[PDB]
Amino acid sequence: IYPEFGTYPGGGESPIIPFGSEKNAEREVIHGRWAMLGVTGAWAAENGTGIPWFTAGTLCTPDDCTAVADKFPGAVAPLAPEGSGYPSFWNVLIIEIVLVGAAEAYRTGISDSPFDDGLTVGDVNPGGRFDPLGLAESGDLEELKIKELKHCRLSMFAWLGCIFQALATQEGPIANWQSHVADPVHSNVLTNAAKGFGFY
Amino acid sequence: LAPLYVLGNSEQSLSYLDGSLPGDYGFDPLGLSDPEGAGGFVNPKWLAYSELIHGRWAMLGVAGMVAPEVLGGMGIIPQETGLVWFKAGMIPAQGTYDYWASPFTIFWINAFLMNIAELRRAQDYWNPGSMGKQDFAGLEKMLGGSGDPAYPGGFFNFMKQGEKDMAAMKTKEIKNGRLAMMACFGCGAQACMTGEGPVKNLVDHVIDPFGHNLLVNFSQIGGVSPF
Amino acid sequence: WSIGSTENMIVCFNTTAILGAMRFGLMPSVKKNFNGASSHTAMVEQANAKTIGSRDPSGFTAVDVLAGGSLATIISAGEILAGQVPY
Amino acid sequence: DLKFDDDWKKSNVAVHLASLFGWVIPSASPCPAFPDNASLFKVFSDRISENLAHFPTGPSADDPIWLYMLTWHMGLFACMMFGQIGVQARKQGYFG
Ligand code: CLA
Ligand SMILES: CC(/C=C/C=C(C)/C=C/[C@@]12O[C@]1(C)C[C@@H](O)CC2(C)C)=C\C=C\C=C(C)\C=C\C=C(C)\C=C\[C@@]12O[C@]1(C)C[C@@H](O)CC2(C)C
Ligand SMILES: CC1=C[C@H](O)CC(C)(C)[C@H]1/C=C/C(C)=C/C=C/C(C)=C/C=C/C=C(C)/C=C/C=C(\C)CCC1=C(C)C[C@H](O)CC1(C)C
Ligand SMILES: CC1=C[C@H](O)CC(C)(C)[C@H]1/C=C/C(C)=C/C=C/C(C)=C/C=C/C=C(C)/C=C/C=C(\C)CCC1=C(C)C[C@H](O)CC1(C)C
Numbered sequence: 001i002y003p004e005f006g007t008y009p010g011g012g013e014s015p016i017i018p019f020g021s022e023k024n025a026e027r028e029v030i031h032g033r034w035a036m037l038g039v040t041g042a043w044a045a046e047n048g049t050g051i052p053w054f055t056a057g058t059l060c061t062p063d064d065c066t067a068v069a070d071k072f073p074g075a076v077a078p079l080a081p082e083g084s085g086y087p088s089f090w091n092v093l094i095i096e097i098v099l100v101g102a103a104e105a106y107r108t109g110i111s112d113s114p115f116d117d118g119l120t121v122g123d124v125n126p127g128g129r130f131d132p133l134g135l136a137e138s139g140d141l142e143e144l145k146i147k148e149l150k151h152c153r154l155s156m157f158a159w160l161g162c163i164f165q166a167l168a169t170q171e172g173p174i175a176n177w178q179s180h181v182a183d184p185v186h187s188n189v190l191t192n193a194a195k196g197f198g199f200y
Numbered sequence: 201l202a203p204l205y206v207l208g209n210s211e212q213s214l215s216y217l218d219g220s221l222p223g224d225y226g227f228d229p230l231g232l233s234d235p236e237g238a239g240g241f242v243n244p245k246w247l248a249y250s251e252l253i254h255g256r257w258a259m260l261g262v263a264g265m266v267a268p269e270v271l272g273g274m275g276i277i278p279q280e281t282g283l284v285w286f287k288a289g290m291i292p293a294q295g296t297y298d299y300w301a302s303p304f305t306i307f308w309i310n311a312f313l314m315n316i317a318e319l320r321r322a323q324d325y326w327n328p329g330s331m332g333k334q335d336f337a338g339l340e341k342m343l344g345g346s347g348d349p350a351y352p353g354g355f356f357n358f359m360k361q362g363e364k365d366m367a368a369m370k371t372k373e374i375k376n377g378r379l380a381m382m383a384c385f386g387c388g389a390q391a392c393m394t395g396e397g398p399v400k401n402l403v404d405h406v407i408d409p410f411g412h413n414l415l416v417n418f419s420q421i422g423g424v425s426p427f
Numbered sequence: 428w429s430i431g432s433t434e435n436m437i438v439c440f441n442t443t444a445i446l447g448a449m450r451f452g453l454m455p456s457v458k459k460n461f462n463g464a465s466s467h468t469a470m471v472e473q474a475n476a477k478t479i480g481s482r483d484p485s486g487f488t489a490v491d492v493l494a495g496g497s498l499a500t501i502i503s504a505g506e507i508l509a510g511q512v513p514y
Numbered sequence: 515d516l517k518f519d520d521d522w523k524k525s526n527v528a529v530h531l532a533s534l535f536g537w538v539i540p541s542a543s544p545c546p547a548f549p550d551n552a553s554l555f556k557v558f559s560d561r562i563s564e565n566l567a568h569f570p571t572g573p574s575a576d577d578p579i580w581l582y583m584l585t586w587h588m589g590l591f592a593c594m595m596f597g598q599i600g601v602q603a604r605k606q607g608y609f610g
């Protein structure tokens with residue numbers, strides 16, 4: 001259901017853009033799960049540490065990646081020994097791209113499917129293996145599907161936000177949010193347009 | 201059939217709690233009201249009757265906690281008479297008032313008055329119709345009872361109120377008795393902790409909920425200690 | 428101590444994790460545990476405690492809540508009091 | 515049948531190695547109770563070295579080697595006994 005605006009892929013069509021390829025539905029949902037994780041990560045990283053997500057791109061560089069050690073709120077220990085440099089960027093990126101590429105190739109059937117029970121390639125939400133808690137079978141899986149997709153679109157809008165705010169304010173989404181909640185009259189996009197977004 | 205009432209019911213509890221008993225919501229997590237294996241003071245009739253007596257006594261008790269304090273604070277009753285519940289002569293070390301007689305004389309008076317009331321009530325509980333038979337100074341006519349020890353429709357119902365919907369009213373009183381038992385539990389509890397009377401604890405929570413609640417009161421668990 | 432402090436967050440995380448675990452069958456619960464089970468890897472539904480009274484669609488009970496909260500408080504005590512010992 | 519089984523021991527090399535080394539390694543791990551975060555195996559080996567210099571002379575009655583020996587051998591033998599029990603029970607139908 002979409003009383004707010006638009007509709008879901010199963011029924012109806014967007015007047016703003018024709019449906020086109022089907023696989024856009026699959027593409028949209030995965031994009032949204034990713035933006036959910038990205039926005040939440042931006043939110044929580046800048047909540048605990050304070051640094052914006054976009055600046056946090058340089059959180060690890062081939063010369064400087066041991067900086068990340070113990071950069072987590074309340075973390076029991078640092079990620080790696082402090083000042084060792086053993087948490088090199090080369091290592092952490094290699095491990096990352098290995099685990100991601102394996103997950104994505106198993107997702108899309110590039111390589112194989114290690115699990116032998118269904119798990120059809122090309123589905124948003126199989127739920128054989130990727131539902132350990134049984135909340136889909138518990139009920140309202142379809143309601144949860146609409147809920148999922150709406151959270152997807154909201155989070156992609158939020159991520160497009162966080163990108164835009166970075167491009168204009170250069171301050172970070174939570175810092176912008178705190179500034180807006182403190183004095184909403186004089187902390188908005190248009191007063192930043194009046195200052196000229198820095199570039200003007 | 202509501203939240204916080206399915207918590208207690210189970211196969212055992214629902215086996216005997218049919219629902220016709222006043223304010224029966226099935227909440228019997230323990231096997232206390234099981235008719236089979238019943239005996240002594242853990243038989244279902246005694247428990248139901250004792251719940252009702254406790255509820256009525258708690259309603260009277262909470263009303264006597266709130267009324268003297270509120271009425272003194274506003275000024276309806278004298279300030280010397282508008283003492284908090286636990287400083288009105290219940291505990292002389294905590295506090296006492298100079299009544300007409302000595303606080304222990306009053307204790308003995310109220311003791312035998314409660315003896316003569318409660319033993320009659322008990323004999324109605326055990327032998328229902330027997331309380332209207334023996335010549336109790338010509339007052340047995342209005343103390344016959346009703347066959348239900350919980351609800352004697354004699355003198356005590358002299359207004360004849362709550363007759364059009366007696367079942368609904370029966371439930372009203374059980375629920376109010378439960379609420380008043382919890383209320384009196386609380387009033388004692390935050391009289392032991394806070395050291396003030398229940399109305400003052402109330403208004404303190406109304407004004408500053410985040411500075412006059414339980415967790416803050418842990419630091420000040422005696423207020424001013426009178427011992 | 429305050430809301431958001433390390434001890435408060437430890438105990439809140441512990442109770443959330445424990446209650447979720449025994450709500451979704453990851454920890455032994457009132458309605459599903461190792462009583463009359465087969466091996467270490469599989470718990471079984473307890474017919475004696477089956478339908479003991481709940482309004483939660485997985486059958487989560489008040490005793491489940493009390494048990495999870497007690498165990499969570501126990502674990503939070505153990506973890507927090509580590510580092511408070513004098514030595 | 516009712517005849518005694520001469521393979522009652524069921525001595526498994528993998529059990530022997532697993533128990534020995536899976537006690538040695540944890541007992542060789544850092545222990546902040548001991549000085550310099552030394553392990554139980556570390557301090558025990560230190561006492562063995564110190565007493566092996568005087569090979570005929572035994573360790574003094576007050577020397578810490580005895581407590582380290584007891585507190586290491588208990589854990590070792592616990593690993594040996596429980597490892598045999600668990601392996602032979604898993605092989606059998608005790609667990610699954
Ligand atoms: C200290 C050593 C130790 C202990 C406690 C355990 C414990 C366990 N193993 Mg074993 N195991 C060990 C070493 C040990 N393992 C080693 C070295 C190997 C390799 C040879 C194995 C191989 C093995 C297999 C193959 C299997 C097990 C399994 C099990 C579990 C089932 C019950 C059992 O057999 O033990 C009884 C254990 C208890 C904890 C019960 C209570 C005992 C009380 C508390 C007294 C114990 C005192 C304690 C050990 C302290 C010792 C110090 C001493 C000074 C007193 C249990 C968690 C089985 C399982 O299901 O695991 C998944 C299984 O299939 N184990
Ligand atoms: C809270 C209470 C009883 C609580 C019982 C509970 C929760 C029982 C719960 C369970 O059983 C169920 C439901 C279901 C079971 O399966 C499970 C359990 C869990 C076992 C009674 C209070 C009972 C409270 C009572 C009786 C209050 C009495 C007050 C009186 C008499 C008067 C006092 C005064 O006269 C003085 C002393 C001095 C004067 O100045 C002032 C006044 C206040 C006027
Ligand atoms: C966690 C975190 C912390 C670190 O510190 C830094 C870090 C970088 C690592 C970071 C991680 C980041 C990650 C993983 C991000 C993932 C992002 C993703 C996948 C975003 C998706 C963005 C999606 C967009 C734009 C879509 C726009 C589409 C639009 C408007 C049109 C929509 C639309 C449609 C089709 C039909 C309607 O009817 C009408 C209209 C036309 C409106
Ligand atoms: C699959 C599965 C199977 C099991 O059986 C059961 C199961 C439950 C575990 C289940 C698993 C589920 C999972 C893993 C769910 C993950 C959920 C997640 C990570 C949700 C995050 C949702 C986040 C959103 C929408 C963000 C909104 C963002 C907004 C408004 C921004 C606002 C904003 C802007 C842009 C500008 C300001 O300056 C700053 C701020 C930031 C304030």
Ligand SMILES: CC1=C(/C=C/C(C)=C/C=C/C(C)=C/C=C/C=C(C)/C=C/C=C(C)/C=C/C2=C(C)CCCC2(C)C)C(C)(C)CCC1
Nearest residue numbers: 442443446483492493494495496497498499500501502504
């Ligand atoms: C989701 C949901 C919800 C929510 C839920 C929740 C949130 C719950 C919670 C719950 C909880 C949160 C609970 C808790 C509990 C607790 C407990 C039960 C505790 C205990 C404790 C103890 C027992 C202790 C002991 C001790 C002491 C005293 C001292 C010493 C030490 C120790 C620790 C041992 C609702 C309903 C809205 C709706 C539905 C869904």
